[PDB]
Amino acid sequence: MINLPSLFVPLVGLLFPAVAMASLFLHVEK
Amino acid sequence: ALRIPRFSQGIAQDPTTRRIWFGIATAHDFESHDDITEGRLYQNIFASHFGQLAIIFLWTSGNLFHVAWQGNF
Amino acid sequence: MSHSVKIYDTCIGCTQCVRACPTDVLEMIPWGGCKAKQIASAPRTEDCVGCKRCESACPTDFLSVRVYLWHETTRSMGLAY
Amino acid sequence: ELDPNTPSPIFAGSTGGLLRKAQVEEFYVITWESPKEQIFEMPTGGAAIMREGPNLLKLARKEQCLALGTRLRSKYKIKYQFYRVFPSGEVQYLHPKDGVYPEKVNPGRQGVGLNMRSIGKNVSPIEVKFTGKQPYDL
Amino acid sequence: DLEDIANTTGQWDVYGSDAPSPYNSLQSKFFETFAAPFTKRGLLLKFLILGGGSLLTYVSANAPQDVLP
Amino acid sequence: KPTYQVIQPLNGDPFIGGLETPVTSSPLIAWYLSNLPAYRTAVNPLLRGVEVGLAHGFLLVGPFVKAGPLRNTEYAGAAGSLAAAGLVVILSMCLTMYGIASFKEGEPSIAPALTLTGRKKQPDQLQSADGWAKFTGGFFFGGVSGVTWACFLMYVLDLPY
Numbered sequence: 176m177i178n179l180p181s182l183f184v185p186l187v188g189l190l191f192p193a194v195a196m197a198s199l200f201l202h203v204e205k
Numbered sequence: 206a207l208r209i210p211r212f213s214q215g216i217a218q219d220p221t222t223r224r225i226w227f228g229i230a231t232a233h234d235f236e237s238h239d240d241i242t243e244g245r246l247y248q249n250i251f252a253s254h255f256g257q258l259a260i261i262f263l264w265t266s267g268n269l270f271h272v273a274w275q276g277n278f
Numbered sequence: 279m280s281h282s283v284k285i286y287d288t289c290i291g292c293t294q295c296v297r298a299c300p301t302d303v304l305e306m307i308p309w310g311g312c313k314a315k316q317i318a319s320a321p322r323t324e325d326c327v328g329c330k331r332c333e334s335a336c337p338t339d340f341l342s343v344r345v346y347l348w349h350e351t352t353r354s355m356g357l358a359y
Numbered sequence: 360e361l362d363p364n365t366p367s368p369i370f371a372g373s374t375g376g377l378l379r380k381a382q383v384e385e386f387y388v389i390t391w392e393s394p395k396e397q398i399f400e401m402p403t404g405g406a407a408i409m410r411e412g413p414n415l416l417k418l419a420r421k422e423q424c425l426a427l428g429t430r431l432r433s434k435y436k437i438k439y440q441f442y443r444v445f446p447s448g449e450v451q452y453l454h455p456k457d458g459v460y461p462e463k464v465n466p467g468r469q470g471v472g473l474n475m476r477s478i479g480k481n482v483s484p485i486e487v488k489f490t491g492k493q494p495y496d497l
Numbered sequence: 498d499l500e501d502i503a504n505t506t507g508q509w510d511v512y513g514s515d516a517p518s519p520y521n522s523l524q525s526k527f528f529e530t531f532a533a534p535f536t537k538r539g540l541l542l543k544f545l546i547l548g549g550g551s552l553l554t555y556v557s558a559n560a561p562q563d564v565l566p
Numbered sequence: 567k568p569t570y571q572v573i574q575p576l577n578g579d580p581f582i583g584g585l586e587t588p589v590t591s592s593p594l595i596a597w598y599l600s601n602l603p604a605y606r607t608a609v610n611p612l613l614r615g616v617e618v619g620l621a622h623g624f625l626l627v628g629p630f631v632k633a634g635p636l637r638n639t640e641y642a643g644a645a646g647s648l649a650a651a652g653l654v655v656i657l658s659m660c661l662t663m664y665g666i667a668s669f670k671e672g673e674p675s676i677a678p679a680l681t682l683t684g685r686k687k688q689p690d691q692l693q694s695a696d697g698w699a700k701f702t703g704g705f706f707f708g709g710v711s712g713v714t715w716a717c718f719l720m721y722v723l724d725l726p727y
């Protein structure tokens with residue numbers, strides 16, 4: 176296929192954040 | 206005007222934002238905040254910093270893991 | 279505590295001494311002998327904010343109060359709004 | 360409002376007092392007497408007049424509405440009077456209750472002044488560890 | 498009294514809060530359920546935040562021959 | 567007729583602010599804004615959803631297709647969708663988890679009309695969660711979609727300048 180290891184910066188530095196900024200808006204409510 | 210943060214109480218129904226910050230910085234003050242007993246406390250620092258040693262090895266692991274396939278050795 | 283700052287003194291006389299402080303302090307509650315015989319440290323404090331205007335005037339001879347209340351409503355800071 | 364227009368304490372405009380959080384929670388309002396048509400100072404920055412009715416201005420929050428005194432008793436009058444309005448009724452009868460003028464004697468009500476032990480040598484720090492059986496909830 | 502003009506038509510007046518336009522174009526239920534799944538909203542959003550956001554980022558980062566940083 | 571309405575600070579009592587000047591309550595404006603969720607809730611939030619989704623939709627194009635990160639695109643997937651069919655998505659649940667500051671759980675259906683409304687105490691809330699859904703659901707199909715007759719529209723353009 177050739178040259179393709181780019182997912183562990185969005186799933187982390189991008190999407191993991193989405194989760195918790197969403198999710199953890201559990202501090203406000205759930 | 207609801208009830209939230211699960212340990213303190215004065216903090217818990219404070220309608221401002223202090224609600225937040227002051228939540229995220231009383232966490233580690235076990236000795237005397239609602240949830241506590243000299244029995245609780247101790248242990249509540251014990252399986253805390255067993256949550257320690259714990260995070261020191263997910264550090265060291267990766268230290269040795271961005272090294273072994275690239276990062277000259 | 280939830281509003282607990284001690285301004286007490288020993289005279290608790292309040293003439294050319296101290297009055298200032300939004301609502302909080304409906305005292306003159308004469309204890310059975312203390313000179314100008316009006317005493318203690320407060321009335322029902324669940325009403326107003328956190329001054330130390332509380333001393334500034336008329337002795338507390340020790341400390342004087344300030345913020346210490348933590349558990350802190352809003353009505354207990356101007357801003358709940 | 361207007362179809363019912365019941366006013367007393369003249370003003371015109373102002374971006375000062377009352378806004379959203381005096382419906383959705385509590386209300387607070389001061390009332391008074393007065394002799395003849397006089398121009399006042401105001402909380403919230405502005406300034407207007409008097410004459411009568413109830414002389415019943417409504418006020419945002421109760422530190423705000425006693426300052427009619429911290430000047431509005433350097434301008435004659437025994438009588439000034441603020442209560443507590445809800446969005447429905449009572450308990451907290453604010454300048455109501457018994458006697459008035461913070462510095463007399465009928466009853467004693469609350470206050471106390473002491474804690475357990477008095478101002479004396481609390482070089483004694485915090486004692487027991489907080490534990491559900493020894494009189495430290497006061 | 499000519500300029501007493503009896504307010505050249507009173508109006509009524511105050512129009513209203515009453516009634517100075519009909520309403521919203523009849524275009525509606527021309528979406529009835531059309532696009533539902535936020536019109537089946539009955540438990541969702543967790544679905545569209547793995548799905549939508551694994552396909553604004555799965556292929557969105559990857560690429561078959563760079564055109565690099 | 568008067569000096570400026572029957573001359574008033576607010577609807578009435580001058581102890582609320584608002585200082586009703588123009589830019590506030592001139593029939594010149596206050597009517598340019600009430601087929602929509604200004605004074606009165608027309609139909610439910612359902613439909614307003616997409617005129618809101620869509621209008622705000624075909625925006626955010628030349629913003630991120632003419633000011634794009636390496637700009638003036640020669641990629642057939644820009645001068646339109648490209649990514650930004652991301653903003654509407656990063657914010658089409660920036661909303662949903664604000665309608666969790668709305669719950670209040672019902673199903674009446676009163677977008678049909680009865681007796682000349684008021685919705686009365688219509689201020690404060692009085693729009694439950696099963697409302698704020700059908701809007702931020704109108705949002706997605708208004709955002710994503712409103713991004714393509716932007717894109718889809720060729721581009722003949724001027725300026726300028």
Ligand code: CLA
Pocket residue numbers: 192193194195196197656659660
């Ligand atoms: C010019 C720059 C500058 C810099 C370099 C910093 C740097 C810092 N500030 Mg800071 N700050 C600044 C200006 C700056 N500040 C200014 C001007 C103000 C106000 C005048 C502040 C007020 C401020 C406060 C109150 C604090 C800091 C803190 C900090 C530190 C926390 C770092 C961190 O990683 O948190 C990371 C931040 C976040 C994770 C929050 C951002 C959330 C965003 C991305 C969400 C976007 C919402 C989105 C639309 C929703 C999509 C939905 C999705 C989530 C599902 C860091 C030292 C904090 C501190 O002391 O910590 C030790 C904190 O106390 N700052």
Ligand code: CLA
Pocket residue numbers: 584585586587588589590591595596599
């Ligand atoms: C982005 C905004 C910012 C914000 C949050 C505010 C907020 C406010 N302004 Mg304000 N203002 C701003 C920028 C802003 N202003 C600027 C840049 C100016 C020029 C100096 C003003 C001049 C101004 C005045 C004179 C007044 C206010 C007032 C107010 C307050 C109430 C008025 C109101 O909401 O009527 C509702 C507003 C509308 C219905 C706006 C409709 C106009 C739209 C349709 C324009 C569409 C543009 C069109 C396509 C072409 C124009 C292209 C381009 C040149 C813009 C409110 C606190 C009033 C006040 O002090 O409080 C009572 C007061 O009257 N403002």
Ligand SMILES: CC1=C(/C=C/C(C)=C\C=CC(/C)=C/C=C/C=C(C)/C=C/C=C(C)/C=C/C2=C(C)CCCC2(C)C)C(C)(C)CCC1
Pocket residue numbers: 195196197199200202225228229657660661663664
């Ligand atoms: C109206 C409208 C809209 C919407 C809006 C909205 C709805 C928004 C929202 C927004 C949101 C909704 C946001 C959020 C954010 C978040 C955050 C900001 C979070 C976070 C965080 C963090 C960072 C955390 C921290 C912490 C905590 C708190 C816990 C403990 C400690 C710690 C540190 C962990 C728009 C504009 C679209 C347009 C249309 C109209």
Ligand SMILES: CCCCCCCCCCCCO[C@H]1O[C@H](CO)[C@@H](O[C@H]2O[C@H](CO)[C@@H](O)[C@H](O)[C@H]2O)[C@H](O)[C@H]1O
Pocket residue numbers: 530673674675
């Ligand atoms: C995709 C198929 C759409 C065709 C409609 C059939 C199912 C609609 C999904 C809701 C499930 C309950 O089925 C329902 O459908 C009808 C709408 O057509 C309903 O009719 C109504 O139901 C709601 C109940 O508060 C109301 O807000 C609306 O007036 C209307 O949608 C009947 O109450 C019932 O039969």
Ligand code: SF4
Pocket residue numbers: 285286287288289290291292295296316317318335336337338
């Ligand atoms: S010390 Fe202060 S308020 Fe206390 S008793 Fe005297 S004046 Fe009264």
Ligand code: SF4
Pocket residue numbers: 298299300302303326327328329330331332333343
């Ligand atoms: S010192 Fe305290 S109690 Fe006294 S007035 Fe000030 S705030 Fe109120």
